[PDB]
Amino acid sequence: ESYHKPDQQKLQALKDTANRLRISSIQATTAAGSGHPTSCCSAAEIMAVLFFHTMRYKSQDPRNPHNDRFVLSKGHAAPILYAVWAEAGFLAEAELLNLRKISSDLDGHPVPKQAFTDVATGSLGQGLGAACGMAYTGKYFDKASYRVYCLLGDGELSEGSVWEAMAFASIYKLDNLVAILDINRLGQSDPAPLQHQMDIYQKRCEAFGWHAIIVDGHSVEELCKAFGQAKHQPTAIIAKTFKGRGITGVEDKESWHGKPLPKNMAEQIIQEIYSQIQSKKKILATPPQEDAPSVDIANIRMPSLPSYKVGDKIATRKAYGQALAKLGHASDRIIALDGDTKNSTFSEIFKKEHPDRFIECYIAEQNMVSIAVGCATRNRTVPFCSTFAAFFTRAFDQIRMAAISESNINLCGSHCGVSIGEDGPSQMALEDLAMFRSVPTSTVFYPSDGVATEKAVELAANTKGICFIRTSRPENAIIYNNNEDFQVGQAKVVLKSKDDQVTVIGAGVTLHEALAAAELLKKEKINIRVLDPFTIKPLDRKLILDSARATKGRILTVEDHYYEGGIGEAVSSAVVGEPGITVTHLAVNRVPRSGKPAELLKMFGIDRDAIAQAVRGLIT
Amino acid sequence: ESYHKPDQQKLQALKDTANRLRISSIQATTAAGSGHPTSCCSAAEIMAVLFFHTMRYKSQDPRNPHNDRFVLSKGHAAPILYAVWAEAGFLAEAELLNLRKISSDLDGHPVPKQAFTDVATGSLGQGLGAACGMAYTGKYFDKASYRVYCLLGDGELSEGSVWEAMAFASIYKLDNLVAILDINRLGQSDPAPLQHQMDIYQKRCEAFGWHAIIVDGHSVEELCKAFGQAKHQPTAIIAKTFKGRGITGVEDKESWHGKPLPKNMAEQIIQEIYSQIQSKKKILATPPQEDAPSVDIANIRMPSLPSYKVGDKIATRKAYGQALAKLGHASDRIIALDGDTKNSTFSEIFKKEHPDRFIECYIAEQNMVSIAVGCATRNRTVPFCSTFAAFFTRAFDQIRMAAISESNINLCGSHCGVSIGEDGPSQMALEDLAMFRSVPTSTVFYPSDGVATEKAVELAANTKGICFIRTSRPENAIIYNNNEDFQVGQAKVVLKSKDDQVTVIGAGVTLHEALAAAELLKKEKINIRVLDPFTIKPLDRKLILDSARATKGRILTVEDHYYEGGIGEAVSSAVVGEPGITVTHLAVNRVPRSGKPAELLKMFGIDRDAIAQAVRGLIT
Numbered sequence A, B: 001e002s003y004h005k006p007d008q009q010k011l012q013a014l015k016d017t018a019n020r021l022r023i024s025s026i027q028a029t030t031a032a033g034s035g036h037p038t039s040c041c042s043a044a045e046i047m048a049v050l051f052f053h054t055m056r057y058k059s060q061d062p063r064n065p066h067n068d069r070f071v072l073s074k075g076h077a078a079p080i081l082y083a084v085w086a087e088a089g090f091l092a093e094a095e096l097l098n099l100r101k102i103s104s105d106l107d108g109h110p111v112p113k114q115a116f117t118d119v120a121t122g123s124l125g126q127g128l129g130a131a132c133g134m135a136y137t138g139k140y141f142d143k144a145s146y147r148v149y150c151l152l153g154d155g156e157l158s159e160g161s162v163w164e165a166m167a168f169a170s171i172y173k174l175d176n177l178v179a180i181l182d183i184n185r186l187g188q189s190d191p192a193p194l195q196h197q198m199d200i201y202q203k204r205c206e207a208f209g210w211h212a213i214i215v216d217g218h219s220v221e222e223l224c225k226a227f228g229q230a231k232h233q234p235t236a237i238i239a240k241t242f243k244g245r246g247i248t249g250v251e252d253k254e255s256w257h258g259k260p261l262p263k264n265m266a267e268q269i270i271q272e273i274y275s276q277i278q279s280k281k282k283i284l285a286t287p288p289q290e291d292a293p294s295v296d297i298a299n300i301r302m303p304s305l306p307s308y309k310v311g312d313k314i315a316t317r318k319a320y321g322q323a324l325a326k327l328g329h330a331s332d333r334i335i336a337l338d339g340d341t342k343n344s345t346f347s348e349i350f351k352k353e354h355p356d357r358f359i360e361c362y363i364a365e366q367n368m369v370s371i372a373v374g375c376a377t378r379n380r381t382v383p384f385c386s387t388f389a390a391f392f393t394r395a396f397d398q399i400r401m402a403a404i405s406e407s408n409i410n411l412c413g414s415h416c417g418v419s420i421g422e423d424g425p426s427q428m429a430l431e432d433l434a435m436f437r438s439v440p441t442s443t444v445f446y447p448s449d450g451v452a453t454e455k456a457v458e459l460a461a462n463t464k465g466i467c468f469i470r471t472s473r474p475e476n477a478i479i480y481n482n483n484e485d486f487q488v489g490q491a492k493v494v495l496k497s498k499d500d501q502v503t504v505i506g507a508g509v510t511l512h513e514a515l516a517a518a519e520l521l522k523k524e525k526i527n528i529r530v531l532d533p534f535t536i537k538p539l540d541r542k543l544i545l546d547s548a549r550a551t552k553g554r555i556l557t558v559e560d561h562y563y564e565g566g567i568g569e570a571v572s573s574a575v576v577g578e579p580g581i582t583v584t585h586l587a588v589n590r591v592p593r594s595g596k597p598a599e600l601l602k603m604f605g606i607d608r609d610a611i612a613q614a615v616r617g618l619i620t
């Protein structure tokens, strides 16, 4: 646990290592014909000191739960990440030359198909949030000794998501977290705004509650000392570096971001760098203290059936909070995150019952999703984050990168559609189905009553990928019995007869408007089938088609969402070309406005009267 | 003009005004049954001083181009915004009681159907970026004397987008910009992280380059003085306030965010506040100096037809930069914004030729979109912002709010799809069509060669709403004559014969792969019709169906995008139910990986060979 103060030979070996990492970054990107060797070279001493002096990890088991974590937030330096894992003996050195090949897993940016990568980066400014999740988990959940190290670029620090993470780390006293800032003066197409004004970087980090140390980022000695000192808060190592360090004629120059060296130049430069290496002997990694606890990864089962009665009224947003609190007794892995909306999403119910597993993320949806991604790495927790579904659009890039990260997180967005009423469109989620459907690993739950909500929470907990649960503000009736069985991809027909003339597909509030339309239409001797998709993605194509063939081929979809990318388009895409099938679509056609929930459902054509009129038109 | 130091009577009139604004905020939200009176009451003195001492504006012409701008970033304080415009004589006082009614335009959050509103807020943390665009426009484009004032909440300051705007304003020396921070200690569901640690707020603002002044937010005299001194930096007025100020039993208490007072309580409280008001006489607004220049509203036309040659190769990303710079020579209203990607999007070409109208926004896509929205308010500029299309997902909430703001901005996202090759999925836009199609005011251009790209830039300049242009990295052949006519909503049949067996719909790289497939298929005596949509939204439904009816009803869509919300689903939703029409859909089915562009097109089943195989399967 004591700092090992390195001797001159260890320091020279660390320099030798840094220069090997430079050579490999050049060799790999020259072989590929693309990549970012100058972004690797500014970080070479940082990487050498982190992996071969400061960090503790099992070199043959990069995912080991006891290891220190490293997050390469500036992911385009991936070639030097691969180089250090070859230097540590995990990767074959020859494989480095296959960078970016379709036959290789050493892809252009890091991805979790690599055993040594937890989260995909590549979209700048997201790695520190993931690192915050890992550090929060290490400190408060695992209660383990591992530390978390996150390397960022300086242009990258213009992303506001970084400063959300900075503030989070100081609020939650993440003394096990270190950010290393590669202040190499340059971004992609110009100098970074602050260039080498190291004092301003320090003042910004200190103002956000971090211990901030300015170092020469090419001094292995200064780096060892800065990483070695006792930590009492999150620590920012602010490293003055030169982009392309060590590449004569390219160091500190513009016009070289993302440009590989041509073969003739790479050969000449590599010879120069090799001439500075004093010994070929490599440093060994040092293994960690193994105090991370075992975690139970068994299937998660609610401790009891939902306790609703048909006819009771409850909003699905409230049912979500009740279900999540119940799920917290079913598994110790469940954690909840929310962005200062816990009294609106009803995640406050989980906080009341399991306060040690609730993370207040404040008004910072970007960071919230990244925290959850970090908490889910190495399967340590099962995260449920919540806010208004509208404000998950604030975090779409984090959610997009979460799927590239093959992350298992759960996201519950409330207040969907116009049915929230008087707040108006800024709070109305009308594009969240389009957004989450376009996330390739996503399962999209749209529970229509309290029972379906509790079952969706339970299914989501056991479902891999990006799970989204769309909850609602109006208090609708329970329609399902408590022992109704639900499955991903299985819809429910909630009203049917042999004389049905249309299959009406609704969800949430429009499912209940469809049921109300059915009772109205029965007064005119018109029966309609009513179908509740349960999951919008994957869609129950078979039950939808079987239903439509029983109702003269006619489908009517009605949704509290815009036309594009929602339920209607999902259904149309599933059934197009099937003989005799037709699809009519009722949705919200423009930015809405303030009014009572029922008034807005009417104004935008998705209430019981609009459904009934649409049905009448189809018959005639 | 000299500061008019107010006398005691002016100060008392300002206190009276603040208390009138409290009373109205309470009356309106109690009448509506919803809203945020405590969030209004913390800002009452700020609002009184801004509108009736500091700012200069035409009370009967809120949109007037010479006016100071006010941005209510904490938009849920909308009732006090409405109250000040009634106090200024623009709104009828009786109409304030109709807050949130479907019969009123005094909606739950501010929206541009209100003459006194430029940008919709309601999604927190976006107003300061819009204000930065307004101030940048005032200082560097209009070169006018108007100032820009933006009121934020303290919980709101957790949004990273705020800090992007803070940094933007100091980089660009926006000394005409004032941020007022309503530090009322509380957010929605808990205290804000920093509560009343005023010194920490000052340190953070100063570290980001702002002149930061702490004031008693309920002292009209301190506010008059703090607002009365212009600075050489953007100025942060850090106002210590109490939430619900002036409401006995509620001031400084939790559990009251977004809670209206019950009628009996509102009556009692209003009587107490009214007893503090010394005079009913109202202060008059003071008008501005009228030095904003006139702006032409005429159609913008390219100075000449495109000058490409059929057969020449150019990537549409480069054609975009060439076309944008060309358009810049025809109209001085065109401005360009980019997020440190100008060498990759080729917006650098516009920077080279029109540097005064280029805005480097650095690696901060949220703020970039908000800057563009602010620059487009009152039609002062015609903005084109650009980055990789994948990174516009970082700004989806800003884009969503831009449509609620009825904003006319143009967005060009490059590097779409797997055809970028070796960088891998973090850089690959595969959900941008889903995203932008779900924005209700959007027009989605997907140009397939350099000619179509120049035409799309020109059309976008003259089209209202959220215009998106999707550009690509491969260097594909010019296929259109320079004099080909292009229109929004009109597709192009680029290959046909009387013996066509399928209509193949492709765009960008998949249009060219479809043309290559047609050549492979002709060796098998199979002709296919090939259709280029040009705009994905709106879609040329008529030409698609007329084509399909000439090709045995058969449509095949192939796209470098995920399945959901893209070209295939747009087509299927347009044609579903049409007799005899069938649609086969080829898209990217999962997160991709690194390889050469041609290798990835083949791996993910959207290259010429996958297209030909699909055609062969349909005919059988």
Ligand SMILES: CC1=C(CCOP(=O)(O)OP(=O)(O)O)S/C(=C(/O)CO)N1Cc1cnc(C)nc1N
Pocket (backbone or CB within 6 Å): A038, A039, A042, A074, A075, A076, A122, A123, A124, A125, A152, A153, A154, A155, A156, A157, A182, A184, A186, A187, A188, A192, A243, A257, B339, B340, B341, B363, B387, B391, B394, B427
């Ligand atoms: C602009 C940019 C880079 C420059 C980063 O500069 P830096 O100072 O943070 O790092 P180094 O100087 O250490 O390179 S790497 C890059 C890519 O597309 C490659 O990922 N991009 C475009 C980019 C834009 N926006 C986001 C959100 N992610 C990105 N990757």
Ligand SMILES: CC1=C(CCOP(=O)(O)OP(=O)(O)O)S/C(=C(/O)CO)N1Cc1cnc(C)nc1N
Pocket (backbone or CB within 6 Å): A339, A340, A341, A363, A391, A394, A427, B036, B038, B039, B042, B074, B075, B076, B122, B123, B124, B125, B152, B153, B154, B155, B156, B157, B182, B184, B186, B187, B188, B192, B243, B257
């Ligand atoms: C959390 C939250 C508010 C608290 C604002 O606290 P503050 O300290 O900034 O301002 P005041 O104390 O002055 O009220 S108002 C708000 C609403 O849904 C209403 O728009 N929400 C939800 C919310 C969450 N996230 C976003 C991006 N916007 C929001 N509007």
Ligand SMILES: [Ca+2]
Pocket (backbone or CB within 6 Å): A153, A154, A155, A182, A183, A184, A185, A186, A187, A192, A243
């Ligand atoms: Ca840099």
Ligand SMILES: [Ca+2]
Pocket (backbone or CB within 6 Å): B153, B154, B155, B182, B183, B184, B185, B186, B187, B192, B243
């Ligand atoms: Ca507050």
